Coordinates of C-alpha atoms and ligand atoms in Angstrom, one line a residue:
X5 CA 25.6 -32.6 154.4
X6 CA 23.2 -29.6 154.5
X7 CA 24.6 -26.1 155.4
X8 CA 26.0 -24.2 158.5
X9 CA 23.6 -21.3 158.3
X10 CA 20.7 -23.5 157.4
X11 CA 21.6 -25.7 160.5
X12 CA 21.2 -22.6 162.7
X13 CA 18.0 -21.3 161.0
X14 CA 16.4 -24.8 161.5
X15 CA 17.3 -24.5 165.1
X16 CA 16.1 -20.9 165.6
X17 CA 12.7 -22.0 164.4
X18 CA 12.4 -24.8 166.9
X19 CA 13.3 -22.3 169.7
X20 CA 10.3 -20.0 168.8
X21 CA 7.6 -22.6 168.7
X22 CA 7.4 -22.8 164.9
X23 CA 8.7 -26.1 163.9
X24 CA 7.1 -28.5 166.3
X25 CA 7.8 -32.3 166.4
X26 CA 5.0 -32.6 163.9
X27 CA 6.3 -31.1 160.8
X28 CA 6.4 -33.4 157.7
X29 CA 9.0 -31.1 156.1
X30 CA 12.8 -30.4 156.4
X31 CA 14.9 -28.0 154.6
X32 CA 17.1 -29.4 151.9
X33 CA 19.3 -28.1 148.9
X34 CA 17.2 -28.4 145.8
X35 CA 17.8 -27.3 142.2
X36 CA 15.9 -24.1 142.8
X37 CA 18.2 -23.3 145.7
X38 CA 16.7 -24.0 149.1
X39 CA 13.4 -25.8 149.6
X40 CA 11.2 -27.9 151.7
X41 CA 11.5 -31.6 151.3
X42 CA 8.7 -33.6 152.9
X43 CA 9.9 -35.5 155.9
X44 CA 7.1 -38.0 155.2
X45 CA 4.1 -38.6 153.3
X46 CA 1.9 -35.4 153.0
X47 CA -1.6 -35.0 151.6
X48 CA -3.6 -32.2 150.0
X49 CA -4.4 -29.4 152.4
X50 CA -2.2 -31.0 154.8
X51 CA -0.8 -28.0 157.0
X52 CA 2.9 -27.8 156.4
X53 CA 3.9 -25.0 158.8
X54 CA 2.7 -22.2 160.7
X55 CA 4.4 -18.9 161.8
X56 CA 3.3 -16.3 164.6
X57 CA 2.7 -12.7 163.5
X58 CA 5.4 -12.2 166.0
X59 CA 7.6 -13.0 163.0
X60 CA 6.1 -11.1 160.0
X61 CA 8.0 -8.2 158.6
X62 CA 5.1 -6.2 157.2
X63 CA 4.1 -2.4 157.3
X64 CA 2.6 -3.0 160.7
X65 CA 6.0 -4.2 161.8
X66 CA 7.9 -1.2 160.5
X67 CA 5.3 1.1 162.1
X68 CA 5.8 -0.7 165.3
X69 CA 9.6 -0.1 165.1
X70 CA 11.8 2.8 165.7
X71 CA 11.6 4.2 162.3
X72 CA 7.9 3.7 162.0
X73 CA 7.8 7.4 163.0
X74 CA 9.8 8.8 160.0
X75 CA 8.2 6.4 157.4
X76 CA 4.6 7.3 158.4
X77 CA 4.2 9.0 154.9
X78 CA 6.2 6.6 152.7
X79 CA 4.5 4.1 150.8
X80 CA 4.3 0.5 152.1
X81 CA 7.2 -1.1 150.1
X82 CA 9.6 1.8 150.6
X83 CA 9.0 1.5 154.3
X84 CA 9.7 -2.2 154.3
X85 CA 12.9 -1.8 152.3
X86 CA 14.3 0.6 154.8
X87 CA 13.1 -1.7 157.6
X88 CA 14.8 -4.7 155.8
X89 CA 17.9 -2.8 155.0
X90 CA 18.1 -1.5 158.7
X91 CA 17.2 -4.7 160.4
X92 CA 19.9 -6.4 158.3
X93 CA 22.8 -4.4 159.8
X94 CA 21.4 -4.7 163.5
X95 CA 23.4 -7.3 165.2
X96 CA 20.4 -7.9 167.6
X97 CA 17.8 -8.0 164.9
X98 CA 15.1 -10.5 165.3
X99 CA 15.8 -11.9 162.0
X100 CA 19.4 -12.2 162.6
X101 CA 19.4 -16.0 161.5
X102 CA 16.7 -15.5 158.9
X103 CA 18.9 -12.8 157.2
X104 CA 21.7 -15.4 157.5
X105 CA 19.8 -17.5 155.1
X106 CA 18.6 -15.0 152.5
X107 CA 20.5 -15.3 149.1
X108 CA 22.2 -12.1 148.6
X109 CA 20.8 -12.3 145.0
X110 CA 18.1 -13.9 142.9
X111 CA 18.1 -14.1 139.1
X112 CA 15.8 -11.3 138.6
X113 CA 16.6 -8.9 135.9
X114 CA 17.2 -6.2 138.4
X115 CA 20.5 -7.8 139.3
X116 CA 21.7 -8.7 135.9
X117 CA 25.0 -7.3 134.6
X118 CA 25.2 -4.9 131.5
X119 CA 26.3 -7.8 129.2
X120 CA 23.5 -10.0 130.7
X121 CA 21.0 -7.4 129.9
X122 CA 22.1 -7.1 126.3
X123 CA 20.6 -10.5 125.9
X124 CA 17.3 -8.9 126.6
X125 CA 18.0 -6.1 123.9
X126 CA 14.8 -4.8 122.3
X127 CA 12.5 -6.7 124.7
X128 CA 9.9 -5.2 126.9
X129 CA 11.1 -6.9 129.8
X130 CA 14.3 -4.9 129.3
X131 CA 12.2 -1.6 128.9
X132 CA 10.3 -2.6 132.1
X133 CA 13.2 -3.7 134.3
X134 CA 15.3 -0.5 133.3
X135 CA 12.3 1.6 134.0
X136 CA 11.8 -0.2 137.3
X137 CA 15.2 -0.1 138.4
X138 CA 15.4 3.7 137.8
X139 CA 12.1 4.2 139.6
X140 CA 13.2 2.3 142.5
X141 CA 16.5 4.1 142.3
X142 CA 15.1 7.6 142.5
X143 CA 12.7 6.8 145.1
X144 CA 15.4 5.4 147.2
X145 CA 17.7 8.4 146.8
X146 CA 14.7 10.5 147.7
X147 CA 14.5 8.3 150.8
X148 CA 18.2 8.8 151.5
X149 CA 17.8 12.6 151.5
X150 CA 14.4 12.7 153.3
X151 CA 14.5 10.1 155.8
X152 CA 18.0 8.3 155.9
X153 CA 20.3 11.2 156.0
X154 CA 18.1 13.4 158.2
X155 CA 18.2 10.7 160.7
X156 CA 21.9 9.4 160.7
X157 CA 20.9 8.0 164.3
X158 CA 18.3 5.5 163.1
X159 CA 20.4 4.4 160.1
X160 CA 24.0 4.1 161.3
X161 CA 25.9 2.6 158.3
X162 CA 25.7 4.1 154.8
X163 CA 23.1 2.7 152.5
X164 CA 24.0 2.1 148.7
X165 CA 21.7 1.2 145.9
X166 CA 22.9 -2.5 146.3
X167 CA 21.4 -2.3 149.5
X168 CA 17.9 -1.0 148.4
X169 CA 17.8 -3.3 145.3
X170 CA 18.8 -6.2 147.7
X171 CA 15.7 -5.3 149.7
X172 CA 13.4 -4.5 146.9
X173 CA 14.3 -8.1 145.6
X174 CA 14.0 -9.9 148.9
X175 CA 10.7 -8.2 149.2
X176 CA 9.2 -8.8 145.6
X177 CA 10.4 -12.4 145.5
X178 CA 9.4 -13.6 149.0
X179 CA 6.5 -11.5 150.2
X180 CA 3.1 -13.2 150.6
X181 CA 0.5 -10.6 149.4
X182 CA -2.4 -12.8 148.2
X183 CA -3.1 -12.7 152.1
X184 CA -6.2 -11.0 153.3
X185 CA -5.7 -7.7 155.0
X186 CA -2.1 -8.0 154.9
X187 CA -0.8 -7.3 151.3
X188 CA 2.9 -7.6 152.0
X189 CA 4.0 -10.1 154.6
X190 CA 7.5 -11.7 154.8
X191 CA 7.2 -15.2 156.5
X192 CA 10.7 -16.6 157.3
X193 CA 9.6 -20.4 157.3
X194 CA 7.0 -20.6 154.2
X195 CA 9.6 -18.4 152.6
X196 CA 11.4 -21.5 151.3
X197 CA 8.7 -23.3 149.7
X198 CA 9.4 -23.1 145.9
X199 CA 7.1 -22.7 142.7
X200 CA 6.0 -25.4 140.5
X201 CA 3.7 -25.2 137.4
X202 CA 2.4 -28.6 139.0
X203 CA 0.3 -26.7 141.4
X204 CA -2.7 -25.2 139.5
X205 CA -5.4 -24.5 142.2
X206 CA -3.5 -21.6 143.8
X207 CA -5.6 -18.9 145.7
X208 CA -3.4 -18.8 148.9
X209 CA -2.2 -22.3 150.0
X210 CA -1.4 -19.9 153.0
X211 CA -3.9 -18.4 155.5
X212 CA -3.9 -15.8 158.3
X213 CA -5.0 -17.8 161.4
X222 CA -0.6 -15.5 168.9
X223 CA -1.7 -15.3 165.1
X224 CA -0.4 -17.8 162.6
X225 CA 0.5 -18.3 159.0
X226 CA -1.2 -21.6 158.4
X227 CA 0.2 -22.8 155.0
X228 CA -1.4 -26.0 153.7
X229 CA 0.3 -28.2 151.0
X230 CA -1.7 -27.9 147.8
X231 CA -0.4 -31.2 146.5
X232 CA 0.0 -34.7 147.9
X233 CA 3.8 -35.0 148.3
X234 CA 5.4 -38.6 148.9
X235 CA 8.3 -38.8 151.4
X236 CA 11.5 -37.2 150.1
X237 CA 9.8 -35.0 147.4
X238 CA 9.9 -31.2 147.6
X239 CA 6.7 -29.3 148.6
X240 CA 5.6 -26.6 146.0
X241 CA 2.9 -24.1 145.5
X242 CA 1.8 -21.7 142.6
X243 CA 3.4 -18.3 143.0
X244 CA 0.9 -16.7 140.5
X245 CA -1.3 -18.0 137.7
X246 CA -1.8 -14.7 136.1
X247 CA 1.7 -13.3 136.1
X248 CA 3.4 -13.3 132.5
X249 CA 6.9 -14.9 132.0
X250 CA 8.2 -11.3 131.9
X251 CA 6.7 -10.8 135.4
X252 CA 7.9 -14.1 136.8
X253 CA 11.2 -13.1 135.6
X254 CA 11.4 -9.7 137.3
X255 CA 9.6 -10.8 140.3
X256 CA 11.6 -14.0 141.0
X257 CA 14.5 -15.2 139.1
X258 CA 12.6 -17.6 136.8
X259 CA 10.1 -18.3 133.9
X260 CA 8.1 -21.2 132.7
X261 CA 8.3 -23.1 129.3
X262 CA 4.7 -22.7 128.9
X263 CA 4.0 -20.4 126.0
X264 CA 0.7 -19.3 127.6
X265 CA 2.7 -17.4 130.1
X266 CA 4.2 -15.2 127.2
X267 CA 2.7 -11.7 127.1
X268 CA 3.3 -8.3 125.6
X269 CA 1.5 -5.4 126.9
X270 CA 0.5 -2.6 124.5
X271 CA 0.0 0.9 125.8
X272 CA -2.6 3.1 124.1
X273 CA -3.3 6.6 124.9
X274 CA -5.5 9.5 123.7
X275 CA -2.7 12.2 122.8
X276 CA -3.3 15.7 124.0
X277 CA -2.2 16.7 120.4
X278 CA -5.3 15.1 119.1
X279 CA -7.8 17.8 118.0
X280 CA -10.6 16.0 119.6
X281 CA -8.8 15.1 122.8
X282 CA -11.5 16.3 125.1
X283 CA -14.4 14.5 123.5
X284 CA -12.4 11.3 123.1
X285 CA -11.0 11.4 126.7
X286 CA -14.6 12.0 127.6
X287 CA -15.9 8.8 126.0
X288 CA -12.8 6.7 127.2
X289 CA -13.5 7.5 130.8
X290 CA -17.2 7.2 130.5
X291 CA -16.4 3.6 129.7
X292 CA -13.7 2.7 132.1
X293 CA -10.6 3.8 130.2
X294 CA -8.1 6.6 131.1
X295 CA -6.0 8.9 128.9
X296 CA -3.4 6.2 128.9
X297 CA -4.5 2.5 128.9
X298 CA -2.3 -0.7 129.0
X299 CA -3.6 -3.8 127.5
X300 CA -1.9 -7.1 128.2
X301 CA -1.6 -9.5 125.1
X302 CA -1.1 -13.0 125.9
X303 CA 0.0 -15.8 123.6
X304 CA -3.0 -17.7 122.1
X305 CA -5.5 -15.6 123.9
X306 CA -8.1 -13.5 122.3
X307 CA -7.5 -9.7 122.2
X308 CA -8.5 -8.1 125.3
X309 CA -12.0 -6.6 125.4
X310 CA -11.8 -2.7 124.7
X311 CA -8.4 -3.0 122.8
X312 CA -10.1 -2.6 119.5
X313 CA -12.6 0.1 120.6
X314 CA -10.0 2.1 122.2
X315 CA -7.8 1.9 119.1
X316 CA -10.8 2.9 116.9
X317 CA -11.3 5.8 119.4
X318 CA -7.5 6.7 119.2
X319 CA -7.7 6.8 115.4
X320 CA -10.9 8.6 115.1
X321 CA -10.2 11.5 112.9
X322 CA -12.2 14.3 111.6
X323 CA -14.3 12.3 109.0
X324 CA -16.0 10.4 111.7
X325 CA -15.8 13.0 114.5
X326 CA -19.6 13.3 114.4
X327 CA -19.6 10.2 116.7
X328 CA -18.2 12.2 119.5
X329 CA -21.3 14.5 119.5
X330 CA -23.8 14.3 122.4
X331 CA -26.1 12.4 120.1
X332 CA -24.1 9.3 120.6
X333 CA -22.7 9.8 124.1
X334 CA -24.9 6.7 125.1
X335 CA -24.0 4.4 122.1
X336 CA -20.7 5.8 120.9
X337 CA -18.9 2.7 122.8
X338 CA -21.2 0.3 121.3
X339 CA -20.5 1.7 117.9
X340 CA -16.6 1.7 118.6
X341 CA -17.0 -1.8 119.8
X342 CA -18.8 -2.8 116.4
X343 CA -16.7 -0.5 114.0
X344 CA -16.5 3.0 112.9
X345 CA -15.3 3.1 109.1
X346 CA -12.9 1.4 106.7
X347 CA -10.8 4.4 106.9
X348 CA -10.6 4.3 110.6
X349 CA -10.1 0.4 110.8
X350 CA -7.3 0.5 108.1
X351 CA -5.6 3.3 110.0
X352 CA -5.4 1.7 113.4
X353 CA -4.2 -1.6 111.7
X354 CA -1.3 -0.1 110.0
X355 CA -0.4 1.7 113.2
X356 CA -0.5 -1.7 115.2
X357 CA 1.1 -3.6 112.5
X358 CA 4.0 -1.0 112.0
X359 CA 4.7 -0.9 115.7
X360 CA 5.1 -4.7 115.9
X361 CA 7.4 -4.8 112.8
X362 CA 9.2 -1.9 114.4
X363 CA 9.3 -3.5 117.8
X364 CA 10.4 -6.9 116.4
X365 CA 13.4 -5.4 114.4
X366 CA 14.6 -4.1 117.8
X367 CA 15.7 -7.6 119.0
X368 CA 19.2 -8.9 118.2
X369 CA 18.2 -12.7 117.5
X370 CA 15.9 -14.5 115.4
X371 CA 13.4 -16.8 117.1
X372 CA 15.2 -19.8 115.3
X373 CA 18.3 -18.6 117.1
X374 CA 16.5 -18.4 120.4
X375 CA 14.9 -21.9 120.0
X376 CA 18.2 -23.4 118.9
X377 CA 19.7 -22.0 122.0
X378 CA 17.2 -23.5 124.3
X379 CA 18.2 -26.7 122.9
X380 CA 21.5 -26.6 124.6
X381 CA 22.4 -25.8 128.2
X382 CA 21.9 -22.1 129.3
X383 CA 22.8 -20.4 132.5
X384 CA 19.8 -19.4 134.5
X385 CA 20.1 -15.7 133.3
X386 CA 20.7 -16.3 129.7
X387 CA 18.1 -19.0 129.8
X388 CA 15.5 -16.4 131.1
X389 CA 16.6 -13.9 128.5
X390 CA 16.3 -16.4 125.6
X391 CA 13.0 -17.6 126.9
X392 CA 11.5 -14.1 127.5
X393 CA 12.7 -12.7 124.0
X394 CA 11.3 -15.9 122.3
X395 CA 8.0 -15.4 123.8
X396 CA 7.7 -11.6 123.2
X397 CA 8.8 -12.3 119.5
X398 CA 6.0 -14.8 119.4
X399 CA 3.4 -12.6 120.9
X400 CA 4.6 -9.5 118.7
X401 CA 4.2 -11.8 115.6
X402 CA 0.9 -13.1 116.8
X403 CA -0.4 -9.6 117.1
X404 CA 1.0 -8.7 113.7
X405 CA -0.8 -11.7 112.3
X406 CA -4.1 -10.9 113.8
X407 CA -4.1 -7.5 112.4
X408 CA -2.6 -8.5 108.9
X409 CA -5.8 -10.7 108.6
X410 CA -7.9 -7.7 109.6
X411 CA -6.4 -5.7 106.9
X412 CA -7.6 -8.3 104.3
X413 CA -11.2 -8.5 105.9
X414 CA -11.0 -4.9 105.8
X415 CA -14.2 -5.2 103.8
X416 CA -16.2 -8.0 105.6
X417 CA -16.9 -5.6 108.6
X418 CA -20.2 -3.5 108.3
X419 CA -19.0 0.0 109.7
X420 CA -21.3 2.7 111.0
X421 CA -22.7 4.2 107.7
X422 CA -23.5 0.6 106.5
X423 CA -25.2 -0.1 109.8
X424 CA -27.1 3.1 109.7
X425 CA -28.7 2.4 106.3
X426 CA -29.4 -1.2 107.2
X427 CA -32.7 0.2 108.4
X428 CA -34.1 2.3 105.5
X429 CA -37.2 0.3 104.6
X430 CA -37.1 1.6 100.9
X431 CA -39.3 -1.2 100.0
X432 CA -42.2 -0.6 102.1
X433 CA -45.6 0.5 100.9
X434 CA -46.8 3.1 98.4
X435 CA -47.4 5.6 101.3
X436 CA -48.5 8.3 98.9
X437 CA -51.9 6.4 98.6
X438 CA -52.7 7.2 102.3
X439 CA -51.1 10.8 102.2
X440 CA -54.0 11.5 99.9
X441 CA -56.3 9.9 102.2
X442 CA -55.9 13.0 104.6
Ligands
LIG1 N1 10.5 -23.2 140.2 C1 11.6 -22.3 140.5 N2 12.6 -22.3 139.4 C2 13.6 -21.5 139.8 N3 13.8 -20.8 140.9 C3 12.9 -20.8 141.7 C4 11.8 -21.6 141.7 N4 10.9 -21.4 142.7 C5 11.5 -20.6 143.5 N5 12.9 -20.2 143.0 C6 13.8 -19.2 143.5 O1 13.7 -19.0 144.9 C7 13.0 -17.7 145.1 C8 11.7 -17.8 145.9 S1 11.9 -17.9 147.6 C9 12.3 -19.6 147.9 C10 13.5 -20.0 148.5 C11 14.7 -20.0 147.7 N6 14.7 -21.2 146.9 C12 16.0 -20.0 148.6 O2 17.0 -20.5 148.3 O3 16.0 -19.2 149.6 C13 13.0 -17.2 143.7 O4 13.2 -15.7 143.7 C14 13.9 -18.0 142.9 O5 15.2 -17.4 142.9

């Protein structure tokens, strides 16, 4: 008892030369929706399935279609969305049966209702998803007026936001980008292999090799067990939440990104910006802070630069434009260190007060049964509160050790050599 549409999709892949007689993997209904359950014992690196470039849905595909003309300037994703939306309506679309399997929605925060989003109140994930929905919105209303509307012929039916977001979703939760020379590919078959924290090797279990999408199973899977792969070792839980409809219990995935910038209202803007760029940092810089990881290199120096101030402004002079970062890296002055510490700490406290539940309430909730979306909200907001508190702790410590640091002035007088020789003896020798 599988499914009708699934029944067809499985057939359509046989009638294309994709699923041969030797494919140790059938489709089945798993907890995570639809997945690929081994049809028999599989081993590490055992190729599971292969698809012909004939069936990709990448920018090259949209460029080789009727709309490739009008989308010539559009960024890659915008182009695929319109292509996806359009192909979706075409009764004669190549992916008629593949589109027949695509869930109309995932648990990504982009599809959450307003109530559902209140559960993420104060969370960065919220700020991020809001910010992303809007941008994707304006960029799609811009496509509606620049490409969609001006070409009513190519785009028959009307296109609503629910259509864009549907595509922006299918794209961001299924596209294999870790591929080489193809950084956005939609492969119908390998599109069913789900994620598992069990896979830890990563680095494309799939490979470009008619053409083919040879996807080799990273783990030894016994008969009847689902085949998995690692979606992304580096993404944070906030990212997994938005990109796919899930997060991991692993606290090491919890991250909170701080955004620093050298304000233009800063009286030394030009010089500071100069130093930042001379060392790889822009006017605005984002530092990702993960749970239990050491602060990102550069966060401190950049913070010290941002809080420089008139007193230590001499470090911006040409004299130091070669060691200034080394000094920022080491430390500038107690006044400067103390300042940045309060700024970071106040921001954490301020941020933490933005949430509507305590970490205790989130953890108690995790102890019961939560629907997919609430579970995601609770999990994410707990992690953020954890990182936020970790950061606050790291800097609360710095505030105490505010005198253990040997700042610029001290470092300068470290080489004074007061106790040398009685030089005056030689002075009189010439
Ligand atoms: N480990 C996991 N936990 C929860 N959902 C998962 C998951 N791995 C994959 N998914 C789901 O499947 C999507 C990836 S594409 C995989 C096919 C999908 N299961 C289907 O029924 O068509 C994700 O966006 C997510 O909604």
